[PDB]
Ligand binder design. Structure first.
Ligand SMILES: [Cl-]
Lengths: 246, 225, 204, 147, 225, 204
């Protein structure tokens, strides 16, 4: 005697796509319900599986010039400390050049880890100068203009001799926060005391005025790459982070 | 601190683990799974497209194209768009899930049509022009709004190519940029009834692969319906 | 019996042969005897343009269909591609310039598969790249395997370029009054693991 | 046979086999060169000298003989893993091909003979496949290829 | 290259493995199952026929005939047709699956009637002329449009023959060319309601066998509804 | 560092590479990947003429500079010769015809180095030859190593033909009234142990 009774639980025929356990199909179109092996044939064996792949590749976030006209202690550039940052842009074709790190984290509600600001100098073996990079712990909105180069030394920072055989200084901003993770508030209409996206701001001071002869540029440009190590993101969401017009 | 200074122009030196100030081990996360594992992430079937039937005994055929060119609604929107441009080559089945909205007691059918074969004109609602025989043959599925209201079936890796891609130009961007096509044909839909809407979402499978990382689409490219 | 081009003969007979392969006691040439690699997997000068003070940031100094470019009488490899229909392979690119130390700025060279699409110029580093900085290096090398949607590239009539090498200004090239306001640039390319398939008399 | 089967699939791959059967008399004499030009089902080939044809893989055959059939095994040569049954689509598209190339039958040596025997010789062309593989079921009764 | 030349007229020599030019091993396919295994192929239940009820308390009886003669709709269509002519003899159960379209709250019944027995006139919608007792006896099934909308039941190999075939002539083509018949009788279908349509599809079973290969139907014979 | 084309760089840097050679799990082509032999040491149809009843005894049906003939776009091997200056090798010739058994007569095919000079036509058998007899065989094969005064043949600008294949009527081709009074003939040639030397962009 057939006796296999099962009660119909709640959420009858309800659909959920928040995860794969419920998003996965319940049947297949494939004949005999077959499957597929792996195939790196024309893929050079470069099989991707993690977003880390992008969040670890230093991409160009911003460029700032260091003119000889800049005097000692003068703030050259200020940048918030959150992966969602990038200001690079090209006129035509019209496009807001987002960074790898950014384009990834932009799809998450939270993040944490050590952001890495790589600074590349484009001088000539004839210039000479130093720039102090200072990270002021806090939130993406803290008036910082009122900070002497001296005052800046209190916070963690690093100076760099531009004129040299080397060309890049790597600034690893340690995860410093009152919260375990920061949120992608760049989606919200306004800002709220507490709901922050960055753990502070980065500053580029003029340690030593840029010196040079006369048959060389009157300044030196600097590319600022951005990437992250020990990064962690969670809570999927959609949003194309716009440009942070500094 | 040695990794605080290096020559990025040199491919080797650039891989030197960066380190500026003294830090301690971050520790352990409080949530089980890693939300950055593509498989687990896209595992969350994201939005693809949506359409609405107007007359009875008609059909809609939307293609699954990675083409960064094809702007939505007639193309990849939101997340799906963004994702399928982070890499150059894609291949593998895809767990599609379509939600039905509105009408009721409407009998329906749907079949997956591989790239390079006969199929009703894309992104257009019209009276099907295919032999019921032909339709079914490609493997189809029947259903009724009343009894269900949603369908989750897997889409096969049936293509004469090794892989497909979104970032392409004119020509190739018209052949090697498609997974395949889906076609939904309704039946018994006296418009004297409510409207009939369909929502399609795609989720990546474990049998899906991703090759070679590209530079993500610039914000201006990321569109949404 | 072996190799391509088979012959079926009814009224058959044996082959007549005289002498055998004589190895030169004193070679008449010291260079490796021609081989697939000798003539195909070697370097060739593809394109060559200039980079000036006028070139603004991100300016594309060169957009090249590396592959298509190689397919041309100008280079010996042509002799191998000119007679085969399809072919898969890897590529090694080498771009070099000569900026005077009194010059400053930089360029970025990236091997982008197919087309740059709408990718963020600022992330070109994701692709196999090579950064050039006046104050540092004047040359860069990149090597990549076969990356395509198809199992091979069709020369006679291609679907879409395998590789589109792009070279943009990573940092405006400025100088001091008097210094040369430019610097020529060259691009070298070569096939790696050249796999040829299908002999054909075609040409287009 | 081969056709009627594959006609129900979207893709295929493998070595097609063209068997040529000669119907001469022990008094004729001639040779025919069979040349396979790798490519797609639509490539103007008329502009190819018998000489040029030798560049591509091919095989000549002496009709006059104790044997009667030459077996031409066309190796799977393509830029794609499989070819598609585009014969269902309205038109053709650069890339969507059904064949891996075209086969040619040249006249290697003019047909000689006395006078009390036919002024020609007919040839049947059988077709089959080895190492064949088809997948992706579909329905379609392939029509005749009016050469 | 020895298999490049042979005498096809000789049954032995014709089996010589052909080989003209030097080739390498093809390799491994990327998809699990082999789509050319008849069992797995036809495993995809293909289209058979379809009909529509007009009046209430009526019935339709369609036969399952391989007859290449019987042209559709009153006969084997599309794939099913093509397939059942690739060989001479067939026997074994068949997993039929019928889809219901349109109407609702319509009670229905269906029974399989073996070849050579009493059964309502074929391919015709009329008031059944069989004892409810007789119908049921042959093993029947009741169902309701509202609750379901589709039925998948297996059809038995109940025939006094060893096998059936399609390719035949007049006489035999009228007896040894049939598996059996199916009959669907509706009830409670006030036509004041929507129309009622039925779609029947057949799939081959593991217990199904196929004997002796025939020359496939010439294109001109392959018809479709 | 290896192969031809060397590059000396002062402001050097390392090479950037991604991925590695991926061997097809499922080859996209089953034919041996192009190689020196694939495209060079294979057979090609050189020349082709007719032999009639009109052709008297000893009539030269064909005088060919085998080598020079191969050096031509028409054949794939060109792709290897077109880019090298000198080259030594061996040759394998195959001449075939199709006379109807109702025909009778014969031809002689000889590979004579340089020129026939004033050698006795009646002794052409001394050279690597192949005799054709209607009543017997319809095909012949000849294979010879490198025989020259120089250590290699110069394609772009030759000194004197390496081989001069000659085909003369060994025995008048007669027939009975009604039979075809002719028979086409073809000549196949190929390089053996093809040794290429000196890559050059020249053409003439
Ligand atoms: Cl209900």
């Amino acid at each position: 005697m057939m006796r296999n009774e099962t009660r119909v639980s709640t959420t009858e025929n309800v659909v959920n796509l928040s995860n794969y356990e419920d998003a996965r199909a319940k049947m297949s179109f494939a004949l005999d319900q077959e499957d597929w092996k792996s195939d790196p044939s024309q893929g050079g064996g470069i099989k991707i599986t993690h977003f880390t792949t992008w969040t670890s590749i230093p991409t160009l976030a911003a460029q700032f010039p260091f003119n000889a006209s800049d005097s000692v202690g003068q703030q050259i550039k200020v940048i918030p400390v959150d992966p969602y940052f990038f200001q690079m842009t090209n006129t035509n074709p019209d496009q807001k050049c987002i960074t790898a790190l950014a384009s990834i984290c932009q799809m998450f509600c939270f993040w944490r880890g050590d952001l890495v600001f790589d600074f590349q100098v484009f001088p000539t073996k004839y210039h000479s100068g130093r720039l102090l990079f200072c990270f002021v712990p806090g939130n993406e909105l803290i008036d910082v203009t009122g900070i002497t180069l001296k005052q800046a030394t209190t916070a963690p920072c690093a100076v760099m001799d531009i004129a040299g055989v080397q060309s890049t200084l790597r600034f690893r901003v340690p995860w410093i926060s009152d919260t375990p993770y920061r949120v992608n508030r760049y989606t919200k209409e306004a800002h709220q005391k507490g709901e922050y996206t960055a753990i502070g701001k980065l500053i580029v001071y003029c340690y030593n005025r840029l010196t040079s002869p006369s048959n060389v540029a009157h300044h030196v440009r600097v590319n600022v790459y951005l990437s992250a190590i020990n990064l962690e993101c969670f809570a999927p969401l959609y949003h194309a982070m716009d440009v942070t017009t500094q | 601190p040695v990794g605080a200074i290096t020559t990025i122009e040199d491919p080797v030196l650039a891989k030197k683990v960066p380190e500026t100030f003294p830090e301690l081990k971050p520790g352990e996360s409080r949530h089980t799974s890693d939300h950055m594992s593509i498989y687990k992430f896209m595992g969350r079937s994201h939005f693809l497209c949506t359409f609405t039937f107007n007359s009875n005994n008609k059909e809609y055929t939307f293609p699954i194209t990675l083409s960064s060119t094809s702007n939505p609604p007639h193309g990849l929107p939101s997340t799906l768009r963004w994702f399928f441009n982070l890499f150059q080559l894609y291949r593998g089945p895809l767990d599609l899930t379509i939600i039905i909205t509105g009408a009721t007691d409407v009998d329906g059918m749907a079949w997956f049509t591989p790239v390079g074969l006969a199929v009703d004109t894309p992104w257009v609602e019209k009276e099907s022009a295919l032999q019921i025989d032909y339709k079914t043959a490609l493997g189809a599925v029947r259903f009724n709004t009343r009894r269900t209201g949603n369908i989750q079936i897997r889409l096969p890796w049936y293509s004469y190519l090794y892989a497909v891609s979104g970032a392409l130009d004119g020509l190739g961007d018209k052949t090697d940029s498609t997974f395949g096509l889906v076609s939904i044909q309704i039946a018994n839909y006296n418009h004297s009834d409510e409207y009939l809407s369909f929502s399609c979402y795609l989720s990546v499978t474990e049998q899906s692969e991703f090759y070679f990382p590209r530079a993500p689409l610039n914000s201006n490219a990321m569109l949404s319906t | 019996g072996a190799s391509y081009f088979t012959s079926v003969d009814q009224s058959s007979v044996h082959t007549a042969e005289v002498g055998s392969h004589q190895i030169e006691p004193l070679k008449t040439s010291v260079d490796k005897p021609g081989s697939k690699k000798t003539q195909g997997e070697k370097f060739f000068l593809i394109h060559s343009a200039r980079w000036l003070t006028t070139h603004a940031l991100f300016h594309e100094v060169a957009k090249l269909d590396v592959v298509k470019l190689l397919y041309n009488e100008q280079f010996a490899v042509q002799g191998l591609l000119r007679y085969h229909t399809y072919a898969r392979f890897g590529i090694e690119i080498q771009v070099q310039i000569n900026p005077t130390p009194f010059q400053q700025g930089g360029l970025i060279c990236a091997m982008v598969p197919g087309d740059q699409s709408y990718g963020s110029i600022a992330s070109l580093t994701v692709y196999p790249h090579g950064l050039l900085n006046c104050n540092i290096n004047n040359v860069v090398r990149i090597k990549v395997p076969f990356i395509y949607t198809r199992g091979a590239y069709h020369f006679k009539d291609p679907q879409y370029p395998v590789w589109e090498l792009t070279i943009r200004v990573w940092s405006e090239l400025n100088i001091g009054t008097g210094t040369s306001a430019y610097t020529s640039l060259n691009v070298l390319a070569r096939f790696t693991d050249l796999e040829l398939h299908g002999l054909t008399p075609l040409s287009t």
